[PDB]
């Protein structure tokens, strides 16, 4: 995808994450765990639902039209009726092909984007207390128990609380 996260620097998805589309796995002093991120998940879902709302249940009413099957050979007029219809169908068929290709490229890109946004947000949050391992994981350079990990996931992590501990751990020899 165009952001390079999904099928990119994130090696693979998590089949065992069934309560969200994006989220966090951690390991700390109290174990290892997983939690879905609802905001990023909802952001992706809302956008996909927006597309769907623009395409599902939105059909157009037509009534009396032209004939499109013919039991007799007639020549010029019938040639024209058939050509008009063939023309129309090919144009709509093209429209449908293009629409799906564009929509699908865009869906993949926007979902990749949301993954990237969550990663970026988390990176900035951690400030000088963690380093990016390159695979979507941060090495957090301080004790970070379950409440600490929760604080990161919930946006209440105060980097200043841990900064001294983290800098000492990062920049030791």
């Amino acid at each position: 995808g165009i952001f390079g996260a999904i099928a990119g620097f994130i090696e693979n998805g998590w089949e065992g994450m069934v309560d969200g589309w994006y989220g966090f796995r951690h390991q700390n002093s109290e174990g290892r765990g997983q939690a879905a991120d609802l905001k990023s998940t909802q952001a992706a879902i809302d956008q996909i639902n927006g597309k769907l709302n623009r395409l599902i249940g939105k059909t157009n009413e037509k009534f009396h039209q032209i004939e499109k099957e013919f039991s007799e050979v007639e020549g010029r007029i019938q040639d024209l009726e058939k050509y008009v219809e063939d023309t129309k169908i090919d144009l709509w068929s093209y429209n449908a092909e293009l629409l799906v290709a564009l929509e699908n490229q865009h869906t993949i890109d926007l979902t990749d984007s949301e993954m990237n946004k969550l990663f970026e947000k988390t990176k900035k949050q951690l400030r000088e207390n963690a380093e990016d391992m390159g695979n979507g994981c941060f090495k957090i350079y301080h004790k970070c128990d379950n409440a600490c990990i929760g604080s990161i996931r919930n946006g209440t992590y105060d980097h200043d609380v841990y900064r001294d501990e983290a800098l000492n751990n990062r920049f030791q020899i």
């Binding site: 995808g1 709509w92 993954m115």
Partner: protein, 317 residues
């Protein structure tokens, strides 16, 4: 020691293949179908007013073929013509059959008003053994077969003004006898002539006496014509034999009515979109069931499937 925090995304074990700008096969976590590819095999009677032609074509119902008497004055959103339909009255043809069928279909009504045409000097109500109604010889219900009276057929010059605020549709015909003999027996002179006119139109027809191949054992024919007469205008029938006269006019309306060729049975159900294959759901934007449709329908496309991604790229573990 510290901690590790990994960001990630879900995946499924059963992904679906979709197309993009650059890839004709890429797996996403989920997708939805955009092409409706099936029908339920019946035309739902709701919410459109369906009129099943059964054995009658619309034109036969119009003319009043005896098996079509139950159709008198009926309206429809969609008239359904069956492939088994057949005529069983006097054999006929309609020059520009397709246009008459179309304009009646589109009008959406068989509403007929009788009118008292001044037919003096001729025998009215001619019947035939080629058009049986309730075991008697009969004729088209909406047509009046005029023949000689006292071995005479005088020159008709009959007027009918349209003082309504709607158009009137007149259906009338010419009889083509099989022989010069039959011609004189019916109309008292060797050569028929019909002129039907209005302020803004004139249609002139000469019969062609001669044999045609037999249809239901009849080698003669009737040719059917029509004339629309607007408000303030007047219908003039100026004839000297061979006229198959109108008994009145059909109302012509405008609106959403049409006609469809189908052998699908009518069901007691509710579906907005009708195709000749049967009604189809209209949740999807596209369909490949039939290019022929009526109502709020997905657009016909050639593809049998188009999958819209509804999830991210699927990257299994």
């Amino acid at each position: 020691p510290g901690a590790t925090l990994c960001l990630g995304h879900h995946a499924v074990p059963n992904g679906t293949i979709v197309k993009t700008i650059t890839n004709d096969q890429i797996e996403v976590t989920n997708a939805t179908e955009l092409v409706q590819n099936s029908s339920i095999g019946e035309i739902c009677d709701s919410p459109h007013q369906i009129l099943d032609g059964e054995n009658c074509t619309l034109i036969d119902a119009l003319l009043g073929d005896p098996q079509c008497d139950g159709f008198q004055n009926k309206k429809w959103d969609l008239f359904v013509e069956r492939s088994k339909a057949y005529s069983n009255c006097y054999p006929y043809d309609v020059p520009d059959y397709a246009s008459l069928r179309s304009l009646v279909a589109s009008s959406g009504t068989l509403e007929f008003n009788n009118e008292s045409f001044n037919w003096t000097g001729v025998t009215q109500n001619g019947t035939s053994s080629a058009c049986i109604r309730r075991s008697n010889n009969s004729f088209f219900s909406r047509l009046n077969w005029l023949t000689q009276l006292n071995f005479k057929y005088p020159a008709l010059n009959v007027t009918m003004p349209n003082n309504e605020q709607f158009d009137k549709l007149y259906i009338w015909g010419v009889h083509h006898p099989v022989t010069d003999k039959d011609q004189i027996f019916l109309y008292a002179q060797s050569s028929g002539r019909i002129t039907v006119s209005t302020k803004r139109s004139q249609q002139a027809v000469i019969p062609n006496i001669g044999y045609r191949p037999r249809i239901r054992n009849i080698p003669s024919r009737i040719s059917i014509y029509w004339t629309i007469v607007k408000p303030g205008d007047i219908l003039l029938i100026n004839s000297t034999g061979n006229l198959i006269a109108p008994r009145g006019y059909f109302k012509i309306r405008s609106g959403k009515s049409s006609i469809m060729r189908s052998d699908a049975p009518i069901g007691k159900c509710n579906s907005e979109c009708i195709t000749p294959n049967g009604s189809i759901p209209n949740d999807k934007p596209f369909q490949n069931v039939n290019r022929i449709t009526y109502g709020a329908c997905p657009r016909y496309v050639k593809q049998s499937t188009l999958k819209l991604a509804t999830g991210m790229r699927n990257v299994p573990e």
